[PDB]
Amino acid sequence: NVQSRGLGVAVRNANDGISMAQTAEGAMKETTNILQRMRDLSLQSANGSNSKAD
Amino acid sequence: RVAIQEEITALNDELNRVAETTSFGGNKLLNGTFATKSFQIGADNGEAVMLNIK
């Protein structure tokens, strides 16, 4: 019975660990997305056609 | 020849003027201030092409 209760708590603790993982993954998608945006327009400024104001 | 010279110096100022008026939005294409400019035409960095307008 002690083992059975311990397993019941164990799935609760492990699911909490999963939730922390996906919560980090939620910001993970966005930081990747904006980083891709940063790379895109830096390539847009990497050419000599645009002036200093651009 | 004097009258012809007036036409020559008129067109002479035209050649100078076009060298200073053509801008492409604030740049100076034919003034000579247009040094070697590289256009980034690749997915990654470094694979650009230099263009020089004397």
Side-chain angles (χ1 to χ4, degrees), chain B residues 1-30:
Chain B
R1 278 162 216 158
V2 162
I4 275 191
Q5 178 46 50
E6 316 278 34
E7 190 146 2
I8 271 294
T9 190
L11 298 179
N12 215 311
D13 290 305
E14 262 309 313
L15 281 201
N16 296 316
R17 164 188 102 72
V18 61
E20 325 260 9
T21 317
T22 74
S23 47
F24 194 88
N27 253 349
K28 273 321 166 282
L29 290 210
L30 307 142

Side-chain angles (χ1 to χ4, degrees), chain A residues 5-28:
Chain A
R5 297 254 287 275
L7 292 147
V9 184
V11 305
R12 266 177 38 79
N13 223 319
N15 273 314
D16 193 45
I18 303 178
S19 82
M20 280 192 213
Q22 24 177 194
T23 291
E25 219 56 40
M28 276 330 190

Side-chain angles (χ1 to χ4, degrees), chain A residues 39 42-52 54, chain B residues 24-27 34 37-40 42-45:
Chain A
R39 183 216 206 255
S42 43
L43 228 40
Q44 160 154 1
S45 59
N47 75 70
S49 84
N50 41 36
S51 96
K52 268 53 66 188
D54 320 60
Chain B
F24 194 88
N27 253 349
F34 194 88
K37 312 250 201 149
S38 59
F39 299 98
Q40 175 56 242
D44 272 83
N45 63 336

